[PDB]
Design a protein around this ligand. Structure first.
Ligand SMILES: O=C(NCCS(=O)(=O)c1ccccc1)c1nc([C@@H]2CCCN2C(=O)CSc2ccccc2Cl)[nH]c(=O)c1O
Ligand SMILES: [Mn+2]
Ligand SMILES: [Mn+2]
Length: 179
C-alpha cells in the first residue's frame, strides 16, 4: 500500500482510474506495485480525454482506453473507410478533420528526446505525434498542434498541477526518476 497509489485514486476521477487498471492488467502489470506507471497511465488517459474535448463536437475518435481488440477494430474501420494507412502500433486518437491518427505523449524529460524515441518506436511516419511535458513545453509533428492555443494551455495547466500535488507529497522525485 504505497502513498503514490492512494494519491492517484483521489486525484483522478474513478472512470479514468478504472480504465488505467484495466489497461495495466492487460500487458500484465499490477497497479499496486508499478505505482509510477499507474500514475503515468492515468495522466496520459486524462490528457487524451481533454485533447478529444478540444475540437468540435465529434472531431476525434478515441482509441486509447479501449481494450486491445476493440481499439484495433475501430482502427480497421477508420482505415477501411478513409483510406488512411494502417499503423503498426495503436494510436490514441483519430482526427476526422485532419484525417490522421494521433499518438499523444506525456513525458518528464525533454520533449525533444522523447519525440525521437516515439517516432522510432511506432515506425508509423503517418501517425501524427504531439508531446506534452510536465513543465509546459510541447512538440508536434510538422509543428502542427491540431488544437487552438486555449485547449492546449488547459492541458499544460493540469499537467503542472499534477506535478505540484506530487511534489507537495514528496512523490515527484521518485516519479520523475521513474521515466
Ligand atoms: O498506447 C500506449 N500503450 C498501450 C498500453 S497502455 O494503454 O497500458 C499505456 C498507455 C500509455 C502509457 C503506458 C502504457 C502508449 N504507451 C506509451 C509508453 C510510454 C512511452 C513508450 N511506451 C510504450 O509502451 C511503447 S509501445 C506503443 C507506442 C505507441 C503506440 C502504441 C504502443 Cl502499444 N506511450 C504512449 O504515448 C502510448 O500511447
Ligand atoms: Mn496509446
Ligand atoms: Mn500516447
Amino acid at each position: 500500500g504505497s502513498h503514490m497509489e492512494d494519491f492517484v485514486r483521489q486525484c483522478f476521477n474513478p472512470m479514468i482510474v478504472e480504465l488505467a487498471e484495466k489497461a495495466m492488467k492487460e500487458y500484465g502489470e499490477d497497479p499496486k506495485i508499478e505505482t509510477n506507471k499507474f500514475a503515468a497511465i492515468c495522466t496520459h488517459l486524462e490528457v487524451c480525454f481533454m485533447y478529444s474535448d478540444g475540437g468540435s463536437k465529434h472531431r476525434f475518435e478515441i482509441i486509447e482506453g479501449r481494450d486491445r481488440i476493440m481499439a484495433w477494430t475501430v482502427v480497421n474501420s477508420i482505415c477501411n473507410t478513409t483510406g488512411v494507412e494502417k499503423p503498426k502500433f495503436l494510436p490514441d486518437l483519430y482526427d476526422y478533420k485532419e484525417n490522421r491518427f494521433i499518438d499523444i505523449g506525456v513525458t518528464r524529460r525533454e520533449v525533444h528526446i522523447y519525440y525521437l524515441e516515439k517516432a522510432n518506436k511506432i515506425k508509423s511516419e503517418k501517425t501524427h505525434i504531439h508531446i506534452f511535458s510536465f513543465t509546459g513545453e510541447e512538440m508536434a509533428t510538422k509543428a502542427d498542434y491540431t488544437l487552438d492555443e486555449e485547449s492546449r494551455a488547459r492541458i499544460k495547466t493540469r499537467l503542472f498541477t499534477i506535478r505540484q500535488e506530487m511534489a507537495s507529497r514528496s512523490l515527484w522525485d521518485s516519479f520523475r526518476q521513474s521515466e
